[PDB]
Amino acid sequence: SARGGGGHDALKGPNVCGSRYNAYCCPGWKTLPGGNQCIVPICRHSCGDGFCSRPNMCTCPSGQIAPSCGSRSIQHCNIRCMNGGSCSDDHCLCQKGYIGTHCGQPVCESGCLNGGRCVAPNRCACTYGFTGPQCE
């Protein structure tokens, strides 16, 4: 009996409401097939890559929580600024070498000598160990 606080009542979970005669899981919370645990919240919209953690609230694998899964959310400048990004009119400003909405996509001026990958501005990694002044 490692677990405790379950109670003598059939209903469980921190979401218990209703009278004894008609006790049930509070609004937004349901029960499991044949079960009576109120640990299953109802999500109005599908979370997709995430999962319903609370009534009308989805939780993404990134840890963020909101009505839906997505980079869009309210926080400080209400946007994701990175790579020296700056907040301007609810928009992230990206400097030379970095682009994208979140300003995290690097730009390779010299490109790659092969199937290399642009890690940073004017920087690329050689996939097949391709030699040269650009990659290598």
Curated annotation (Swiss-Prot):
Residues 3-39 are annotated as: Fibrillin unique N-terminal (FUN) domain. Cleavage of N- and C-terminus by furin is required for incorporation into the extracellular matrix and assembly into microfibrils. The C-terminus, which corresponds to the Asprosin chain, was initially thought to constitute a propeptide. Fibrillin-1 and Asprosin chains are still linked together during the secretion from cells, but are subsequently separated by furin, an essential step for incorporation of Fibrillin-1 into the nascent microfibrils. O-glycosylated on serine residues by POGLUT2 and POGLUT3 which is necessary for efficient protein secretion. It is linked to Marfan syndrome: A hereditary disorder of connective tissue that affects the skeletal, ocular, and cardiovascular systems. A wide variety of skeletal abnormalities occurs with Marfan syndrome, including scoliosis, chest wall deformity, tall stature, abnormal joint mobility. Ectopia lentis occurs in most of the patients and is almost always bilateral. The leading cause of premature death is progressive dilation of the aortic root and ascending aorta, causing aortic incompetence and dissection. Transmembrane segments: none annotated. Residues 39-70, 73-104, 105-136 form the EGF-like domain. It comes from Homo sapiens. Disulfide bonds join C17-C26, C25-C38, C43-C52, C47-C58, C60-C69, C77-C87, C81-C92, C94-C103, C108-C118, C112-C124, C126-C135. Belongs to the fibrillin family. This is Fibrillin-1. It is found in: Secreted. Changing G85D: Found in a patient with Marfan-like syndrome; likely pathogenic.
